[PDB]
Amino acid sequence: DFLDSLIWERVVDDQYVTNPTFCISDYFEIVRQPGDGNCFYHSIAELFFDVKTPFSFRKVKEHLRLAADAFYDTEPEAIGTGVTKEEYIQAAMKDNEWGGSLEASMLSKQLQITIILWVVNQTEQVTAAIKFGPGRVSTALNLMHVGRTHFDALRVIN
Amino acid sequence: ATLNILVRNDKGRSSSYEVQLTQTVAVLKQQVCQRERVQADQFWLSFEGKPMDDEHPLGEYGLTTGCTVFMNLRLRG
Numbered sequence: 518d519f520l521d522s523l524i525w526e527r528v529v530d531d532q533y534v535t536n537p538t539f540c541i542s543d544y545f546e547i548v549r550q551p552g553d554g555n556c557f558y559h560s561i562a563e564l565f566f567d568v569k570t571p572f573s574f575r576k577v578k579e580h581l582r583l584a585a586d587a588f589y590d591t592e593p594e595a596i597g598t599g600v601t602k603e604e605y606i607q608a609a610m611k612d613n614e615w616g617g618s619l620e621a622s623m624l625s626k627q628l629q630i631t632i633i634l635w636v637v638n639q640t641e642q643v644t645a646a647i648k649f650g651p652g653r654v655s656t657a658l659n660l661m662h663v664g665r666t667h668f669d670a671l672r673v674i675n
Numbered sequence: 676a677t678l679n680i681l682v683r684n685d686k687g688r689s690s691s692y693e694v695q696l697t698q699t700v701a702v703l704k705q706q707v708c709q710r711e712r713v714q715a716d717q718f719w720l721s722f723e724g725k726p727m728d729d730e731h732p733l734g735e736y737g738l739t740t741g742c743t744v745f746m747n748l749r750l751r752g
Contacts, residue, residue: 526745528724528745528747529724529726530724534687534745534747536686556752596728596729616751616752617750617751617752618749618750618751619749621750636685636750645686645687647747647750662750663752
């Protein structure tokens with residue numbers, strides 16, 4: 518199928534990028550998440566857990582604390598930042614604190630899952646996707662990044 | 676001895692940049708900010724599977740004429 522036939526460019530380790538151009542709605546269903554600053558963790562929780570509550574995102578952030586302690590110091594996105602592992606963890610653990618690609622990279626390795634962030638413009642057209650982990654699209658946790666400020670969850674249409 | 680390298684942007688488009696192997700990655704990131712109209716903290720660069728550190732000269736990554744440096748977005752939402 519279309520999604521599993523995309524060509525992925527390896528960035529570093531198990532991080533890949535691809536730049537197709539298609540409307541996100543033609544292949545995914547959007548599962549909308551609140552704009553409370555936790556949308557990234559909401560979106561992961563929507564797809565990773567079987568039960569969704571307004572506080573499921575906190576279980577994802579518990580895994581993030583374990584992931585950061587084991588992977589932050591070797592994260593390619595965290596080079597040239599000058600922020601230590603301890604400074605990042607307690608700052609990332611605050612309520613309503615945004616997350617994204619750095620958190621996806623570490624959670625991918627902690628949970629042994631593949632996470633894909635689909636970057637979407639205002640026309641709902643894909644401009645880029647970043648895949649964390651070796652899996653394919655149909656088995657990955659697919660998130661939609663809209664307005665460069667928000668994350669929703671995506672489910673592959675059949 | 677200036678060098679011509681390609682940078683693949685966040686849309687996957689590649690364009691030429693004139694660099695010196697002795698200049699730091701941070702200087703190359705400044706050139707990418709100027710052309711792509713972005714801020715330096717919004718992306719990091721990689722080459723041949725290795726992240727490029729801001730304070731290191733480009734020569735330390737083995738850049739040659741016609742090679743492609745990847746522009747990788749820092750996403751937050």
